Amino acid sequence: VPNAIKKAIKAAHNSLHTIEIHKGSIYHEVIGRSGASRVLLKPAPQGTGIIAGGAIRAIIELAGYSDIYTKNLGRNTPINMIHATMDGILKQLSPRRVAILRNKNLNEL
Amino acid sequence: MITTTKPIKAHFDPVADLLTKINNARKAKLMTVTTIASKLKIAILEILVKEGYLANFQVLENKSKTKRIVTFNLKYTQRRIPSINGVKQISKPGLRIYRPFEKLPLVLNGLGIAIISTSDGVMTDKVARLKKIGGEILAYVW
Amino acid sequence: ATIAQLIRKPRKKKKVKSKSPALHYNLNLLNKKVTNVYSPLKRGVCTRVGTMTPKKPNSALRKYAKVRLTNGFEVLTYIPGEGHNLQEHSVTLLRGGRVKDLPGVRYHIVRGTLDTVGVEKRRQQRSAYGAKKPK
RNA sequence: CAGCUAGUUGGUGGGGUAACGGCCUACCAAGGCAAUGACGUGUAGCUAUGCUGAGAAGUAGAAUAGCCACAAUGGGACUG
RNA sequence: AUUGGGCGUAAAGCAAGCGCAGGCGGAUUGAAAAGUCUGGUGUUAAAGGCAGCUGCUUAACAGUUGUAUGCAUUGGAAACUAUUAAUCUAGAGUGUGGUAGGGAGUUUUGGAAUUUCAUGUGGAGCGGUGAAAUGCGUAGAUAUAUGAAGGAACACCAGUGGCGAAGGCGAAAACUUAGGCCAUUACUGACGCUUAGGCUUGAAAGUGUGGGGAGCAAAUAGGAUUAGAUACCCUAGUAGUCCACACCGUAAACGAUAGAUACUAGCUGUCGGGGCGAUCCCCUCGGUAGUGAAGUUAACACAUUAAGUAUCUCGCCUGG
RNA sequence: CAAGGAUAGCACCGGUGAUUGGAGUUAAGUCGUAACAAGGUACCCCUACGAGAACGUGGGGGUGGAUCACC
RNA sequence: AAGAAAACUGCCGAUAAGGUCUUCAAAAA
Ligand SMILES: [Mg+2]
Ligand SMILES: [Mg+2]
Ligand SMILES: [Mg+2]
Ligand SMILES: [Mg+2]
Ligand SMILES: [Mg+2]
Ligand SMILES: [Mg+2]
Ligand SMILES: [Mg+2]
Ligand SMILES: [Mg+2]
Ligand SMILES: [Mg+2]
Ligand SMILES: [Mg+2]
Ligand SMILES: [Mg+2]
Ligand SMILES: [Mg+2]
Ligand SMILES: [Mg+2]
Ligand SMILES: [Mg+2]
Ligand SMILES: [Mg+2]
Ligand SMILES: [Mg+2]
Ligand SMILES: [Mg+2]
Ligand SMILES: [Mg+2]
Ligand SMILES: [Mg+2]
Ligand SMILES: [Mg+2]
Ligand SMILES: [Mg+2]
Ligand SMILES: [Mg+2]
Ligand SMILES: [Mg+2]
Ligand SMILES: [Mg+2]
Ligand SMILES: [Mg+2]
Ligand SMILES: [Mg+2]
Ligand SMILES: [Mg+2]
Ligand SMILES: [Mg+2]
Ligand SMILES: [Mg+2]
Ligand SMILES: [Mg+2]
Ligand SMILES: [Mg+2]
Ligand SMILES: [Mg+2]
Ligand SMILES: [Mg+2]
């Protein structure tokens, strides 16, 4: 265990992805797919807390996000749950970048 | 003027025809596509270019005025990644979706656009909310 | 499948079966009809007691018992606890359960209820096995 | 559970009913329902509601409240 | 699993086709306003439900005010669907012009090869096997040469192939007949896709009647092997395999992948029509294969002939 | 007019029944070794017959078959 | 010079029951 522990430790240190938060939560509802694992993430009002359980709850706490609605619609393998959760959070679109591209006004309608 | 060489065909359902064309062009990084022109399809393209997902949409007619085809292009940035992320049609043939104004959907918390044709042709979800009138829901575009 | 296909033949839900079916039958006796009324626990006489070996992983002598519930249905039941008194004609009260090793038994002989003396010399888990207070 | 229905379908004159009405009568006809499920079987008082569910809904129709039906079983009528 | 699932290898695409009713469905114009949206009015009993307040020592609880959901009627909206009145050809068909096929049925014909019989030569084995033995042979077998009869199947051609919806189709000819590909300045003008029920076809085995029977061979007999052999081997051997007319309607009936429509890199083959004109090769339109990225998958793998991006319709699946 | 009674034959549903058929569960039994490797006769599907039994053989259908091989 | 080269088959059946074994990363003056 000690060996494998520190191995995975350094491993995550190497592969670290960058996450952006909006008011502590996730901006838009998203479904993360990885194999046969599908994880649904939904924006939450400030106060509900992390309604996640298992791999998703660990990810949400470790990412920084507070309020988050989740449901595991697929398998219960921790590796695939982490894969599906990270895929859903990485495909997220910022409210800013969209309009920039889209040639609109910052967030204005 | 614009000439072609290939025959232009279209599926019978005018919303998902466009959606399949758009998704395939987006996935394959293709730019110029063609399809048969209908007033509903023309009108839906009218609201999309004001909201900014495609650049141009050109409809042409024959010398006899019996057939028309609209040829639109997508808005790719310099690095070649599109503005459309995903399109999904709700009111497919057979099962038509009717939602009142109070139950008008919000696509991706307002980032995407919902196409709703209430009584004066297609209209985006936000302006539909402004008019406090609802109706037919064509497709989800984000 | 398809909207038209499902409109014609809707989705039929799978059924649900009980685990203690013999416990939900009440005989009126005046008409001799069997109605389906759920009941927590019922009563039954006894028509055979002895030993029977278990399934595969577990091998040990075990006590079983046949019963004739208030209604007209016979089911094999296991004699729980250590020490027994059944003698081919002792009333008993039965509840739900499932002994994994023995195939067919799906009820437990409630201890210390009618003609079954509670297993004495029992402290821990004395409520389940019908025992009062040694103090 | 694939045919069911012979006062069943319609008209005529009359009677009866608080009232319309094969509700009943005599005559004249042969229709009516049914694969979009008649008919038959089994089951059950219905609803507002109770419990559960993010929702769509699932489930039981405690108490109580609305409506219906019943008063040992099966029929008839008086009074009003 | 309408929201909210799947059917190549895990349960699940009927064997295939012709298909009525049903569902879905090209483009444009006009009307109506049945869906759809919206305004007004009525109602949806009270209690309960959610929000606020009060009263019980606060609560539980009780009261209090607020709080929807649907239906009907009326007044408008006309984008889509539905209805009706019409126009158009791009869908689908028809004709003309090119054209490839073992597509099917009926009737005739032909040659190798086996068997039997007939006639010669001939003289001791032949046959069979892991090794042998039943068996055939001086009544002259096997072999060799010629001839006759009869039944069944059609070497080579024959394929990194063709046709049909599937099962299937391969000697030659005639008659009848089905579908398909390419180009259309022609024509009708949405006549189209799917299909519950229904109808047609549907390998081989099997059935009934009447023929036929060369070879082969379930069942059966014998000789081997074996601890035993009702099996694998050998020698015999009936039904059957064949034809006509009637049934049976099942197969790993498999591309383990329903049909239709639009789009999505490329490369290598091969076949057909068309364009050029020795082949060869180039291009176009299609059919049949290999390799292969995005994409999909649990993986194997699929990948323009999808299991990819999507729609319509039908069939089917819900632990053993 | 008519509850009820008697007679009469059909219709539907239930219980039980000598005897008998298979089925699951099971103790370690009794005869083979059919399948998984080329499982020692490749396997599997449909069908007909036969045999203590798994199964054998004939006809058709498939590779969800091994070995084999090509510079 | 274009060669090849060739399989071959006797017989060969069975193996009583239930059974360990991963303790753990908290992380270390
Ligand atoms: Mg009742
Ligand atoms: Mg739920
Ligand atoms: Mg009540
Ligand atoms: Mg009650
Ligand atoms: Mg009483
Ligand atoms: Mg599933
Ligand atoms: Mg399967
Ligand atoms: Mg098939
Ligand atoms: Mg099948
Ligand atoms: Mg057809
Ligand atoms: Mg039709
Ligand atoms: Mg249209
Ligand atoms: Mg109320
Ligand atoms: Mg209250
Ligand atoms: Mg000869
Ligand atoms: Mg046959
Ligand atoms: Mg014999
Ligand atoms: Mg022989
Ligand atoms: Mg016979
Ligand atoms: Mg079958
Ligand atoms: Mg086949
Ligand atoms: Mg491939
Ligand atoms: Mg079961
Ligand atoms: Mg074997
Ligand atoms: Mg052997
Ligand atoms: Mg074998
Ligand atoms: Mg014997
Ligand atoms: Mg045999
Ligand atoms: Mg066989
Ligand atoms: Mg034999
Ligand atoms: Mg065979
Ligand atoms: Mg020997
Ligand atoms: Mg043995």
From Swiss-Prot, chain A:
Signal peptide: none annotated. Belongs to the universal ribosomal protein uS5 family. Coiled coil: none annotated. With S4 and S12 plays an important role in translational accuracy. Located at the back of the 30S subunit body where it stabilizes the conformation of the head with respect to the body. The N-terminal domain interacts with the head of the 30S subunit; the C-terminal domain interacts with the body and contacts protein S4. The interaction surface between S4 and S5 is involved in control of translational fidelity. Part of the 30S ribosomal subunit. Contacts proteins S4 and S8. One of its GO terms (cellular component) is small ribosomal subunit. GO terms for biological process: translation. This is Small ribosomal subunit protein uS5. Keywords: Ribonucleoprotein, Ribosomal protein, RNA-binding, rRNA-binding. The gene is rpsE. GO terms for molecular function: rRNA binding; structural constituent of ribosome.
Swiss-Prot record, chain B:
GO terms for biological process: translation. InterPro entries: Ribosomal_uS8, Ribosomal_uS8_CS, Ribosomal_uS8_sf. Signal peptide: none annotated. GO terms for molecular function: rRNA binding; structural constituent of ribosome. Keywords: Ribonucleoprotein, Ribosomal protein, RNA-binding, rRNA-binding. One of its GO terms (cellular component) is ribonucleoprotein complex. SUPFAM superfamilies: Ribosomal protein S8. One of the primary rRNA binding proteins, it binds directly to 16S rRNA central domain where it helps coordinate assembly of the platform of the 30S subunit. Belongs to the universal ribosomal protein uS8 family. Part of the 30S ribosomal subunit. Contacts proteins S5 and S12. NCBIfam families: PRK00136.1 (NF001109). This is Small ribosomal subunit protein uS8. The lineage of its organism: Bacteria, Bacillati, Mycoplasmatota, Mycoplasmoidales, Mycoplasmoidaceae.
Curated annotation (Swiss-Prot), chain C:
InterPro entries: NA-bd_OB-fold (IPR012340), Ribosomal_uS12 (IPR006032), Ribosomal_uS12_bac (IPR005679). GO terms for cellular component: small ribosomal subunit. One of its GO terms (biological process) is translation. Pfam families: Ribosom_S12_S23. It comes from the Bacteria. The keyword Membrane does not apply. The keyword Transferase does not apply. GO terms for molecular function: rRNA binding; structural constituent of ribosome; tRNA binding. PROSITE patterns: RIBOSOMAL_S12. Keywords: Ribonucleoprotein, Ribosomal protein, RNA-binding, rRNA-binding, tRNA-binding. SUPFAM superfamilies: Nucleic acid-binding proteins. NCBIfam families: rpsL_bact (TIGR00981). With S4 and S5 plays an important role in translational accuracy. Interacts with and stabilizes bases of the 16S rRNA that are involved in tRNA selection in the A site and with the mRNA backbone. Located at the interface of the 30S and 50S subunits, it traverses the body of the 30S subunit contacting proteins on the other side and probably holding the rRNA structure together. The combined cluster of proteins S8, S12 and S17 appears to hold together the shoulder and platform of the 30S subunit. Part of the 30S ribosomal subunit. Contacts proteins S8 and S17. May interact with IF1 in the 30S initiation complex. This is Small ribosomal subunit protein uS12. It comes from Mycoplasma pneumoniae (strain ATCC 29342 / M129 / Subtype 1).
